Amino acid sequence: WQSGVHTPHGVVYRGAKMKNWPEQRIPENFKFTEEQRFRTKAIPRDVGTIPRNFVLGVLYRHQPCEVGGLWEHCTNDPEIVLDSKRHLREVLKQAREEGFVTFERDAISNEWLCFLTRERYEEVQRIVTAKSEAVDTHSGLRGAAATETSTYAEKFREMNVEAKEAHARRLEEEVANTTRYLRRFQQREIDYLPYTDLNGKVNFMWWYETRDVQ
């Protein structure tokens, strides 16, 4: 995916980037032929466990979501694993096929929303809790830092309901800010390699790493 040929010039997606994929500059006068645009074939994205779990975590964070702001929420999420809006749409389609999430339409705002199914909500909650525990185990801090974090968590728990909601809004906006800042220092490289299973079908194995950019 390039900024000029697949999207209008000037736009850019704040997400994980593919490894060794050059972001080559495309001239402004570039245009596709009407017949050449039909025969364009895109590479398949990863709708696997990691992307579906990321999207399910975002959909559990925002209850419920809307298809318009879903990409904004995914970009604000710190550990984004999606490549672009096409990857997001493919992961949404895979979640719909698997039955994790359903798509409804609000008769008030005339917009499509993404709700979580009642049967899979328990598994989504389990996945979110496991991811939270993994992030807690991976995060490093000293004794005083851990004590301050525990005190802040206890204060947020003892706060009221609307107080907790305002605290969550402030926390998520500060998370968005710190993610936009940290993205300039490090990014997420997605690597892929095709292979063929025992059924003669071609599918890709994917790796996800983090690399510092200075």
Partner 1 sequence: IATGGRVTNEDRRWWLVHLECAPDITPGTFIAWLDCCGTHTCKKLIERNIWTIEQVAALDSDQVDELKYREGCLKMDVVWEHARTIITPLRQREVTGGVESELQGRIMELRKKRELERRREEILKERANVSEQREETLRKLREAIAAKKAA
Partner 2 sequence: KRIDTAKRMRRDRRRIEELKTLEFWGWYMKLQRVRGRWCREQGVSSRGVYGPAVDAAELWG
Partner 3 sequence: KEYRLTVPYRSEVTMLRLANHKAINSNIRELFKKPLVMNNIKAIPRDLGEIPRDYVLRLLFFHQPIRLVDLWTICKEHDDVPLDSAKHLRLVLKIAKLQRWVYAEKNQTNNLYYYYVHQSRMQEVQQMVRASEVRKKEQESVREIEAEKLRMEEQERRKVALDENIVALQNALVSNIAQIQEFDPGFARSKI
Residue ranges in contact with partner 3 by CB under 8 A: 60-61, 63, 78-79, 125, 128-129, 131-132, 135-136, 138-141, 145, 149, 152-153, 156-157, 161, 164-165, 167-168, 171-172, 174-175, 178-179, 181-182, 185-186, 212
Q: Residue 186: what residue type? A: Q
Contact criterion met (CB below 8 Å) for 208 and 188: yes
How is 119-144 classified by DSSP, letter by letter?
TTHHHHHHHHHHHHHHHHHH----HH
151 binds, among partner 2, partner 1, partner 3, none (CB under 5 to 8 A by kind): none
Which one of 22-30, 44-52, 133-141, 150-158 is the stretch in contact with partner 1 (CB under 8 A)? 22-30
Q: Which strands sit side by side in the sheet containing 202-212, from one edge to the other?
A: 17-18, 186-196, 202-212
Burial class (CB in 10 A: 0-12, 13-18, 19+), 52: buried
Piece in contact with partner 2 (CB under 8 A), picked from 7-15, 65-73, 107-115, 195-203? 195-203
Q: Which of partner 3, partner 2, partner 1, none does residue 150 bind to, with CB < 5 to 8 Å depending on kind?
A: none
Q: Which is nearer to partner 3, 2 or 151 (CB)?
A: 151
Q: CB nearer to partner 3: give 145 or 205.
A: 145
Is 29 one of the binding residues for partner 1 (CB under 8 A)? yes
Cα 193–Cα 198–Cα 199 angle in degrees, nearest 5:
100
Identify residues 25-84 at the interface with partner 2 (CB under 8 A): 40-44
Give the three-state DSSP class for 71.
helix
Nearer to partner 2, 45 or 73 (CB): 45
Contact set for partner 1, span 47-66 (CB under 8 A) = none
Minimum distance from residue 24 beta carbon to partner 2 (Å): 7
HEC per residue, 88-100: HHHHHHHHHHHCC
Which residue pairs, CB below 8 angstroms and at least 24 apart, start in 69-78? 70/114, 74/15, 75/13, 75/14, 75/15, 76/172, 76/175, 76/176, 76/179, 77/179, 78/175, 78/178, 78/179, 78/182
Instruction: Residue 153: name its binding partner from partner 1, partner 2, partner 3, none (Cβ under 5 to 8 Å by kind).
Output: partner 3
Applying CB under 8 A, which residues contact partner 1? 4-5, 24-34, 36
Applying CB under 8 A, which residues contact partner 2? 1-2, 5-6, 18, 20-24, 40-44, 191, 193-195, 197-198, 205, 207
